């Protein structure tokens, strides 16, 4: 039991501020060696965060993070080599006036990708909610991403319980007409309009033009709706789904699900559940699926930890009587999984004191080869015999700052072996498969100002777009 003397500790200034914190680390591969991992929180003249950093960049004596605020309150401006920068502002009421993102790491960071969001509002007498907000693209095609319609107090609205409601929200991909409500507060209905052709990537769902006399050019004919009724407790009593489906449900005295039925598109509604039953912990205990297969659940009564779950087919069933699974799990005192087994046989694990799962072992299928950007073939038919799967070891490696190094494996009887690197930045979390580059200085160019990645694969470019 490795874990003896691996505590964590937090440290404070005379203002009681959380100046520093420590975690002890120890790989079971390194049982004689204990690492001390630490990071810092500098505080300002205001008694608030001045600086806090990546441990490894810090101990390499590089500074890479920033956080800046109003007179008290909250961050105005904030940067990392990972995140890029970020700026906002909001009202005295906290209503937002502006936000910006995807701004680079030089004198000043690059505002040309700021993807600016700004907001338009209810005015006197109305309470002051935003009636719209827009993507105010810097120096470019600024476009109104969304628009809110708030109802009045007509008797119609009152009956629909839509008084003051956001009875429309036009948005990216179109509009929700918040088009009726029950006195419980749950909807009586909503209508969704998708775009005039949701196929057409360049009808933008940006609400240029003054009203739907224009925006009809941007909303579908393929409009759909949901209609609903509910408990006084608000749980669903029934529902309708305009393509042709529909819903009904029933419950136990504590509100737990007993049974349910759903109308299939344009046709019958039929029962789902055959049995469903629960523990004193309220968690499931005894069930039977609509196909008639039977399940039960098992807990440590001292702790409610699930020790296992078991399932079988009944006598004379269409697929015949059979135990389908008997899941059993092995835990450390904290509860980390040490091993698992099932029958219808085993696997096992290792951890650092810091609970990095450093090793895993068990059965995996032969012949799939080294995992890449792919899904290999299923075995067909379903294997009647077990030797098609084989022993493996799988292992992993990590930084004292929050980064990984390599992944390392053998399935020896298959001869499938690898060790594979994520190249990671000399000065950030940015990192990629070795295939893209092996060089930790070069890797950080493979990312956007937000730090979104350029590519999936050697040429598989990632089309990042405004609003990230």
């Amino acid at each position: 039991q490795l874990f003896s003397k691996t505590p964590s500790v937090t440290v404070f200034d005379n203002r009681g501020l959380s100046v520093r914190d420590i975690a002890y680390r120890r790989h079971p591969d390194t049982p004689k060696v204990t690492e001390e991992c630490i990071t810092y929180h500098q505080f300002d003249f205001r008694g608030f965060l001045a600086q806090s950093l990546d441990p490894r960049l810090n101990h390499k004596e590089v500074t890479n993070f920033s956080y800046l605020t109003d007179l008290n309150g909250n961050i105005i401006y904030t940067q990392s080599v990972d995140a890029g920068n970020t700026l906002v502002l909001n009202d005295t009421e906290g209503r937002s006036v502006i936000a910006m993102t995807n701004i680079s790491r030089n004198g000043k960071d690059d505002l040309s990708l700021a993807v600016t969001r700004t907001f338009q509002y209810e005015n006197a007498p109305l309470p002051g909610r935003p009636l719209s907000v827009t993507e105010q693209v810097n120096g470019e095609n600024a476009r109104i991403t969304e628009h809110f319609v708030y109802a009045g107090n007509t008797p119609q609205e009152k009956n629909l319980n839509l008084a003051g409601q956001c009875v429309s929200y036009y948005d990216a991909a179109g509009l929700i007409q918040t088009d009726s409500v029950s006195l419980t507060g749950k909807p009586l209905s909503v209508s969704r309009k998708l775009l005039k052709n949701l196929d057409d990537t360049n009808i933008l769902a940006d609400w240029q033009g003054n009203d739907t006399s224009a925006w009809n050019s941007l909303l579908a004919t393929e409009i759909y709706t949901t209609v609903t009724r509910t408990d006084a407790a608000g749980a669903v009593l029934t529902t309708i789904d305009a393509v042709g489906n529909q819903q009904r449900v029933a419950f136990d005295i504590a509100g737990q699900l007993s049974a349910s039925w759903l109308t299939l598109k344009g046709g019958q509604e039929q029962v789902i559940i055959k049995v469903l039953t629960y523990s004193a912990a309220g968690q499931k205990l005894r069930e039977e699926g609509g196909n008639g297969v039977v399940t039960t659940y098992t807990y440590e009564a001292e702790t409610q930890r699930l020790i296992g779950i078991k399932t079988e087919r009944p006598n004379g069933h269409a697929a015949g009587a059979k135990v389908l699974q008997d899941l059993r799990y092995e835990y450390d005192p904290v509860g980390n999984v040490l091993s698992i087994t099932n029958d219808a046989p085993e696997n096992a694990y290792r951890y650092d004191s810091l609970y990095q799962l450093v090793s895993a072992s068990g059965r995996e299928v032969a012949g799939a080869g080294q995992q890449g950007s792919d899904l290999p073939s299923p075995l067909v038919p379903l294997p009647s015999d077990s030797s098609v799967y084989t022993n493996y070891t799988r292992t992993y490696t990590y930084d004292s700052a929050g980064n990984l190094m390599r992944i390392r494996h053998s399935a020896p009887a298959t001869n499938n072996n690898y060790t594979l690197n994520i190249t990671v930045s000399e000065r950030s979390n940015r990192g990629v498969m070795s295939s893209l580059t092996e060089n930790p200085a070069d890797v950080d160019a493979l990312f956007t100002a937000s730090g979104s990645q350029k590519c999936l694969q050697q040429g598989q470019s990632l089309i990042w777009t405004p609003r990230g």
Binding site: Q1, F3, S4, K5, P7, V9, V11, F12, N14, G16, R20, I22, E36, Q42, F43, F45, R46, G47, L68, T69, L71, N72, I76, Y77, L87, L89, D91, T92, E93, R95, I98, K108, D109, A114, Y121, A124, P125, G152, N153, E157, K158, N159, L160, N161, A163, G164, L183, L188, A232, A233, D252, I253, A254, A280, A301, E302, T303, Q304, D332, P333
Partner: protein, 1476 residues
Amino acid sequence: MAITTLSLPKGGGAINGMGESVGQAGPDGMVTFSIPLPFSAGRGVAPALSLSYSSGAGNGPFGMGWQCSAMSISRRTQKGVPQYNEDDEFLSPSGEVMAIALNDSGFEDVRTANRLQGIPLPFSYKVTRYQPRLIQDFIKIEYWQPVKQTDGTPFWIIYSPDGQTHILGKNSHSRVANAENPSQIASWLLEETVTPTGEHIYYQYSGENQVNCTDAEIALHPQDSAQRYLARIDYGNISPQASLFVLDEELPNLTQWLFHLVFDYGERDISINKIPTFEGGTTGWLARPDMFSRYDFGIEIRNRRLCHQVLGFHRLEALNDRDVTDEIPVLVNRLTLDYDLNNSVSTLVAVRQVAYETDGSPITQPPLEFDYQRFDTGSIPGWQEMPQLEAFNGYQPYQMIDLYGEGTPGILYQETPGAWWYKSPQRQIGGDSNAVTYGAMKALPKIPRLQEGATLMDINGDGRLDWVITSAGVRGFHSIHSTGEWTHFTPLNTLPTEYFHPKAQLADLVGAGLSDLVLIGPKSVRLYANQQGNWAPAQDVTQAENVSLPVIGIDSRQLVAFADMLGSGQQHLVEITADSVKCWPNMGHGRFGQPLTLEGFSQPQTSFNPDRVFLADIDGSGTNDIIYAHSECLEIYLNESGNRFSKPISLLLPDGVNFDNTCQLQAADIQGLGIASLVMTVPHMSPTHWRCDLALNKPWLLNVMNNNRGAETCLFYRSSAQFWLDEKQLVEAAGQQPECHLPFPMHLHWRSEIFDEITGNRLTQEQEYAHGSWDGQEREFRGFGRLIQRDTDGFAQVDIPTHPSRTVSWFATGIPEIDTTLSAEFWRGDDQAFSPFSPRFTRWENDSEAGSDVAFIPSEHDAFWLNRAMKGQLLRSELYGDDGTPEAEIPYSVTEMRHQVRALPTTDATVPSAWCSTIETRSYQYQRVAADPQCSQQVVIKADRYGSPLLSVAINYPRRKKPEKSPYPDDLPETLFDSSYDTQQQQLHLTKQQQNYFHLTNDDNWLLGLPKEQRNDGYQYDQERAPANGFTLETLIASNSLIGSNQPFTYLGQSRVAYQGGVDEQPSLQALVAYGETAILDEKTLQAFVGVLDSKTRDELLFSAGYQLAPRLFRVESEPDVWVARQGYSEFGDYSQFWRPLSQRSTLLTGKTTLKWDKHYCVVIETQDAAQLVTQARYDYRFLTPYSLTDANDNQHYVVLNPFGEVIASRFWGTEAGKDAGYSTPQAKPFVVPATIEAALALSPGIPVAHCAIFEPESWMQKLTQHDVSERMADNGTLWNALLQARFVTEDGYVCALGRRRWMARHGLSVLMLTLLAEIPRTPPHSLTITTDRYDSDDQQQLRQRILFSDGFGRLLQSAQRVEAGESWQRSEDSSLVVNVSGTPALVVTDNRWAVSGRTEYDGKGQGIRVYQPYFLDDWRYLSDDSARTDLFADTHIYDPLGREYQVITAKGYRRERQYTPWFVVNQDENDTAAN
């Protein structure tokens, strides 16, 4: 803050009680307990009265030691009988001495005025602003006397700093005045108050009367007209008035006040099975067994009445504003005030909240119940020999006084010159700290001690003795300290009265502690002359020639004495025959009242030798009791309330002994117990002494507190003389010198236990104190030098090892000789901690610049008064917890304070007035490690003539040097102890905050110190900047202060408020806000924007965010403006609208909101927002609470409440897009909630309601009645009836909680009283509820069948929900688990299954240790603590002495562990902890 919305109900809660707990320790040490009265606030203008008991109190209508006085202002007379002239003296309602003020021109506050609040008066008053000797807070006093006495009466006015303004004693009912010359007034009762809202409260009194008053009451106590009692209070005035209602030529009708408190002294039918009538009935107020009378003013008071019930009344159809005829307010609730009675005392047994159902049934809360340690005549012990003294009496061989001031006499045998030999009281070795003995004599240097009128008299009244010198021509004294310091001789400005003889030498009637001789008999009265140990001329007086004449010194079977049969404290003249007793009322200088006979005494005239009587009070009331000797027995006569006498107790003497003319009986506290024992010598044999410890405990101490919910207490109490004996024992163990000057055995709280009636756990708390303190000049108490507390729970459980509490503290006695020494008592394991604070003596100056104090050196007089002002200030305290570790000798923390005392000028040529100020504070957080505390200090710098906190500074000190080796355990990864550091720890920090105020402080406005402006800034510095002893005031004011004007800083904030009002957004008298204002953004903060924005984009974002620039506060010359927010835009009615809020708008950017009020301007009936969303409500004015609501969609919600105003059922219904939905309307489908859990379980679904709930606060008690038991015992129900007077069972048939003990135990009476209980188990106070998930139009309606349980206090104990049938554990009827043969919990199928939730077991501080897992049960009733402890799984939270978990254990031994240090905290998990 935003709109006070019409509110959708939450629908539930937990069972209440009231005020359940007594406070922590205090330097008075006196037992006291108190709870506010449970009656409605009205519009927020309702009285603040409270029930209170104190061991320090006298007697009254509340019962003995109880107290619920209104506020009143009064004469001062503890020196003696007042003058009734110019020279009279007076006291504030808070109890403080009062004096004529000075104007700021240097002259007294004299003027005459012809208007009040500018309302013109019919005739002018001489008026004076009045000054207390010591300020608690700066309330303004004016006294009002007619310009000539024919022009009515004087009266009083008070002004609060919050402007609440009060008048006292304009009328006779509101005045207490001489029954035979009302030109003399003793006190002015609170009669009216006014608010700036023009709202009021009015207070109605009654005098005494002959209702239920007997012949003897008239004959002995005719002059009752001075007395007063509170008859009614009323409030909620329908018309606002900024001036007093007293200014009406007649007061408006009862109907003008919509809320009323009616006080009933047993008048209405005390039965609960009837709603009280608003009127009283033909009873009138009752009599009492135990009427007392007082003469504390040279005039009678006679005290005939006690309460029984108090009733709250709301004028319903006025409040509804629906009818005007016959405005009968309903009784909202009845307080019951239930008393124990005896012919000398009465006191509350109990109290209850009661309210009445629409069927007229009472409904009742479970009572709160009391008991008191009390006198007895049954239990008395047999007599005991006195080896210690056994022969040393009978003429010369006895001599005794408490020369040392032990609070206990020592036997100072003295025979000759020098024979002064003090056999002294000592603790016995071994046994309880109660056993005491006279140790051996000692010799000490002394006066030649003869030919001098020798006596160890304190002539001065110090409480500390002189010795009298009076030889031929030779006259003075010496003074002797407790040290035995016989001071040098004292000539006395000597003018004693000529000693013609001792015959009829008076002592008491000059005034307590002021005693002086008078030689007197018939038809004349010489005057006493003693002041303080000097004398006036011995003047001559007589009382009126009709007054019967008392005269000492005839042996004819008769006696006379100065001895208070009456127990006022004045040792009245009393004359005794063989057959009768007569006593003369004290009348002060030269005067007596006509004597009263006291009934009951007699003895056979054949044989009544007078000297066979003995004089002592025995009952402890003050009433002198009587003892008479038979040769075999004592006859003991006990004084009934100071009126007549009980049947005599006959007491058998020690066996074979006979009482005779040699025998000397006495009573004394040789026990040191604070209540005496009989002590006697029989100088016949060589042994002679005997005692009887008649009194086991001092009576009349409230010793048990209970509520029937399940709270109960054992309370414990101890003599100061006993504590001092312990102190003296230690003092001489140190060889130190006894100067614990406190010449009186006060008796004080010592220990208490609180026992949880339910779980059987309990809480132990105990206290001790040292250097009891006394004013040797003013003759008054001065506290203790040190206080100590300790505490643990006691546990039903070894799983909880206690680690017992300790804390110690020190307070100002105001006596340098003591106060200096306390410093030496301080813990000093650390020594880097800074040298202490000290009291700053300072004088206020109207300095002709802005006003300031100036620190100064008082004279010896001034210092005396100033220290007497610092009296009781907390100086220091020191916190500990005890365990197996060698750091229980180290504090967790220590705290210390600096005070400053402001002197103020006076018309008093002898002393100033004063105020005291807590100018500095500091603490060290040690975490029981002495080396490296965290340290912090907070200080004030600027304050005005009204002491407002204008400027403050606070400090957080840098860390000490890194330790030379780990003070912390070896278990730590060793690198930690080298790693746990930051430069930030070495960064010193200081904090600046500064503010100023308005003062509408003229005419009849007294609005002190209203908030005007505030700012914040901060400083940081290196450790090397630290001043030598840290900071003090003198450090912080300096030109080289680190926050002096030279020193730059980060600005951090400012705030302001604009008022709406008469000028310049300065406050109205109502000081309504126009808008709130705060700073938000600053030049340095802008540099965050600089990476993105520009001037225009910055400015437009700021303005669109609504901020503006404004002047920066406390800008001296050149500072930039700053961006501010402004908030809270709202509007209000006028005074005629009671200034009610009409609308609100958090900021102008938002949509507004609008409010609508009832005609009384009490209730917001209706509202709408500026999106025009309506909301509506309709209101139960019993509770000022909406029984209905309507939303903006016109969906209704409706709710119904019990007579106390508990929510008990609710429903909602409304509109549903071309349909109406929810339940039915209430009147469409009415319902009533069932009476019981089983009655509710009988219900079907389909009920037209969202919810209902049921409750049992009384569930803890069994309820027992004639029905069954009349079969079992058939004693014609005489028990069934009398168990109420036995208070075993209440009027509503519950087993009364103390009753259960009381009647079984008192004579071991019928075991039935226990046998018939447990068929109902004591059931935790609990509730059941249903809420329905679907409308009654659907036959599918799920019901949330849920129950919850709480302790005797309000702690949630556990809860359950009914669940679908299935396997469950099984409850036994006796609450046991059902179990298998192996004792396994009986896990079996049940239909009545529940899921059980939330159970835990708790510390008395509520900390849940064992938090249990969920489980099934077959029953709603409670499952036993014992079986739970036996079987049920829980994690166990493990708390430090601060109450922090340093560990938690899983239900299976693995742990989470945490350890705390001043600079860091360590954390460990179940795996790392498995190293254990």
